[PDB]
Design an enzyme around this catalytic site. Sequence first.
Site, PDB file in Angstrom:
ATOM      1  N   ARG A   1      -9.901  15.179  -3.340  1.00 39.88           N
ATOM      2  CA  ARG A   1      -9.363  15.449  -1.981  1.00 39.88           C
ATOM      3  C   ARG A   1      -9.172  14.098  -1.238  1.00 39.88           C
ATOM      4  O   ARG A   1      -8.097  13.816  -0.642  1.00 39.88           O
ATOM      5  CB  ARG A   1     -10.242  16.467  -1.216  1.00 39.88           C
ATOM      6  CG  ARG A   1      -9.513  16.980   0.025  1.00 39.88           C
ATOM      7  CD  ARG A   1     -10.315  17.949   0.848  1.00 39.88           C
ATOM      8  NE  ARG A   1     -11.609  17.446   1.293  1.00 39.88           N
ATOM      9  CZ  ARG A   1     -12.613  18.266   1.600  1.00 39.88           C
ATOM     10  NH1 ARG A   1     -12.409  19.595   1.521  1.00 39.88           N
ATOM     11  NH2 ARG A   1     -13.778  17.789   2.037  1.00 39.88           N
TER      12      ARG A   1
ATOM     13  N   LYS B   1      -8.280  14.958   5.885  1.00 40.65           N
ATOM     14  CA  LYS B   1      -9.621  14.608   6.404  1.00 40.65           C
ATOM     15  C   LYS B   1      -9.528  13.149   6.775  1.00 40.65           C
ATOM     16  O   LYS B   1      -9.818  12.262   5.946  1.00 40.65           O
ATOM     17  CB  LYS B   1     -10.695  14.770   5.329  1.00 40.65           C
ATOM     18  CG  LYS B   1     -11.998  15.259   5.899  1.00 40.65           C
ATOM     19  CD  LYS B   1     -12.773  15.835   4.731  1.00 40.65           C
ATOM     20  CE  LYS B   1     -14.156  16.058   5.267  1.00 40.65           C
ATOM     21  NZ  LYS B   1     -14.209  17.175   6.179  1.00 40.65           N
TER      22      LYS B   1
ATOM     23  N   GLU C   1     -10.104  27.578  12.305  1.00 38.77           N
ATOM     24  CA  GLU C   1     -11.392  27.129  11.741  1.00 38.77           C
ATOM     25  C   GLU C   1     -12.277  26.695  12.876  1.00 38.77           C
ATOM     26  O   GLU C   1     -11.817  26.543  14.019  1.00 38.77           O
ATOM     27  CB  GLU C   1     -11.196  25.947  10.750  1.00 38.77           C
ATOM     28  CG  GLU C   1     -10.474  24.728  11.297  1.00 38.77           C
ATOM     29  CD  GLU C   1     -10.514  23.539  10.337  1.00 38.77           C
ATOM     30  OE1 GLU C   1     -11.399  23.531   9.465  1.00 38.77           O
ATOM     31  OE2 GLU C   1      -9.695  22.593  10.444  1.00 38.77           O
TER      32      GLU C   1
HETATM   33  C1  PLP Z   1     -14.834  18.434   5.906  1.00 39.16           C
HETATM   34  C2  PLP Z   1     -14.204  19.520   6.802  1.00 39.16           C
HETATM   35  C3  PLP Z   1     -14.361  20.982   6.524  1.00 39.16           C
HETATM   36  C4  PLP Z   1     -15.176  21.515   5.374  1.00 39.16           C
HETATM   37  O1  PLP Z   1     -14.806  20.902   4.151  1.00 39.16           O
HETATM   38  P1  PLP Z   1     -15.882  20.940   2.935  1.00 39.16           P
HETATM   39  O2  PLP Z   1     -15.004  20.334   1.888  1.00 39.16           O
HETATM   40  O3  PLP Z   1     -16.367  22.330   2.791  1.00 39.16           O
HETATM   41  O4  PLP Z   1     -17.027  20.169   3.542  1.00 39.16           O
HETATM   42  C5  PLP Z   1     -13.710  21.940   7.325  1.00 39.16           C
HETATM   43  N1  PLP Z   1     -12.998  21.564   8.379  1.00 39.16           N
HETATM   44  C6  PLP Z   1     -12.814  20.296   8.795  1.00 39.16           C
HETATM   45  C7  PLP Z   1     -11.989  20.018  10.040  1.00 39.16           C
HETATM   46  C8  PLP Z   1     -13.411  19.176   8.011  1.00 39.16           C
HETATM   47  O5  PLP Z   1     -13.214  17.885   8.409  1.00 39.16           O
HETATM   48  O1  AKG Z   2     -18.761  16.082  10.107  1.00 39.35           O
HETATM   49  C1  AKG Z   2     -17.494  16.054  10.130  1.00 39.35           C
HETATM   50  O2  AKG Z   2     -16.903  15.116  10.701  1.00 39.35           O
HETATM   51  C2  AKG Z   2     -16.577  17.135   9.519  1.00 39.35           C
HETATM   52  C3  AKG Z   2     -17.180  17.974   8.387  1.00 39.35           C
HETATM   53  C4  AKG Z   2     -17.719  17.167   7.193  1.00 39.35           C
HETATM   54  O3  AKG Z   2     -17.381  16.017   6.960  1.00 39.35           O
HETATM   55  C5  AKG Z   2     -18.726  17.723   6.272  1.00 39.35           C
HETATM   56  O4  AKG Z   2     -18.929  18.968   6.204  1.00 39.35           O
HETATM   57  O5  AKG Z   2     -19.354  16.876   5.588  1.00 39.35           O
END
Ligand code: PLP
Ligand code: AKG
Lengths: 285, 290
Positions: free
Chosen positions: B52, B151, B184
């Site tokens: 990812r 992300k 979300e």
């Molecule tokens: C990281 C993230 C998630 C969850 O992703 P995982 O891969 O399950 O940790 C969901 N929403 C947002 C906005 C994120 O930055």
């Molecule tokens: O903490 C954040 O900024 C978003 C979600 C994330 O990165 C996580 O689940 O590890």
Amino acid sequence: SELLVYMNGEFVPESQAKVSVFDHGFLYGDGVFEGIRAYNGKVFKLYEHIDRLYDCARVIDLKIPLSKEEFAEAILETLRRNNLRDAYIRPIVTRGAGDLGLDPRKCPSPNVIIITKPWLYEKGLKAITVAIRRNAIDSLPPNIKSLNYLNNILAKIEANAKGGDEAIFLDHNGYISEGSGDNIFIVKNGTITTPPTLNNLKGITRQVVIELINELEIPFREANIGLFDLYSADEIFVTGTAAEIAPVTYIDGRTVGNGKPGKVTKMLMEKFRERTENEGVEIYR
Amino acid sequence: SELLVYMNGEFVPESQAKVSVFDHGFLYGDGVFEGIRAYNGKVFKLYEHIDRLYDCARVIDLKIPLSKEEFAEAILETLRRNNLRDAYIRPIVTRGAGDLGLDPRKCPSPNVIIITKPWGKLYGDLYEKGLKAITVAIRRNAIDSLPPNIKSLNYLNNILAKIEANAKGGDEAIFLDHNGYISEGSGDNIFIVKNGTITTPPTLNNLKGITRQVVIELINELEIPFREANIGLFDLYSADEIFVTGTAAEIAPVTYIDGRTVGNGKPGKVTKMLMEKFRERTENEGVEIY
Ligand SMILES: *Cc1c(COP(=O)(O)O)cnc(C)c1O
Ligand SMILES: O=C(O)CCC(=O)C(=O)O
Ligand SMILES: *Cc1c(COP(=O)(O)O)cnc(C)c1O
């Protein structure tokens, strides 16, 4: 010798000016910034830039830990320390370090940073209309001059691949918004139109040019416009601190007028030059 | 002993881990990041997270200057150097420094950072009682402005949302998008349960969660009726159960939305079951650190 960077009251050499990777400004672009010109020893529109900074911080619920007055003095001192007269200035305020999550409540102390750097054409810019739309007023309001600039970078990536010096955004409604870092104006049969600032940013340079337009009594409107207006305009120009007034002589490969800066643009460019010569806050005084 | 932070191959003590102010990750949030959990000496879904990361970088046209295998090795190496067995991992790749302006072509050297810390479950003592969630007025970044699937270091949309939930009595913010679809939470995916059926939004207007993917695998294995479909406020307000998912949060139950009691007011049956099946997965899978 080496340029110094204001960092929380300390003045640190450029190459050593660094922030904790735990600063939310770095982790999440959680902060705001400005851009300011000094021309021949004076700072142009200093207090309009500082006021906007404080508005932007307020919109993101960030307390800048300096009164506006201290902020102006820090900007002038930073220029003095570096012996600059013609310069570009970049103040930044960030949330400061917290934990690794989003929550700004865990960030007890903002960082304040001011960068100073030493410092148009008769040819004009080639503008490209981009597929990516401006950040929306109800998701990431574009009036916030924040450190979340990836909307703008994506557009700039497109303009780079598509033969443009500058990217032009539309918003979700199909309205012209602005360039990736500059406001837009068009000129058609002697009338000037620029978008209302809602779907773009309340530019300082844009404001000054509206004043100049009103001084010259050129017919003026602040009205939403679309592609049809861009593609049949007699002149196009963009505005911002770094670019000043920049003619746009091509739009999506289409020649604007005869492909040279237009009459009205040129009049505005010279009135704007006088203004940057005659008004500002003196650094060495 | 002080935690070390990976910085372009160097391992730097936490409190000296710093980035030039000229880095476009700092000027413009021009980078991407990940969130990965190490549980008892293993890294859960290490390679997925890395995939990812690379996709997100490609979306912003950012060339990561390590191969995927090198990145994996760097993550494991950073964890080893800190003698960590249970950790949160935050890798970050930024555009590096260039001109002061936003032009990324003028930025020759991306910057690669890997933070590893112990960091408690996001929520962290609310998993017995459940979260109070609040729908926010701010909408999610639009798919054609700032695609929410990236992300990225541009997380002010998510932060604005979190600020609203702070002021409005919530542990978590729920986004809608511009169409009025549920998107979300500010930092985690959302699922709902109604009459035995689980629904979750397609990922287009939110983010392709690795936890959400693991939970869907679990839903299929448990043979629970399951739908990926757009939903609205009506569905949120009428749901038997609500939960959110992410690396940091794991699976968190949501027992209130906008002050309305979700079913019971305590974690539902389906949520608790999935929570239990999820803990199991975190025990049996992962790349060995040591
Ligand atoms: C990281 C993230 C998630 C969850 O992703 P995982 O891969 O399950 O940790 C969901 N929403 C947002 C906005 C994120 O930055
Ligand atoms: O903490 C954040 O900024 C978003 C979600 C994330 O990165 C996580 O689940 O590890
Ligand atoms: C800074 C900025 C402008 C122009 O503002 P000035 O105050 O004239 O420098 C326009 N658009 C965007 C997106 C900007 O970041």
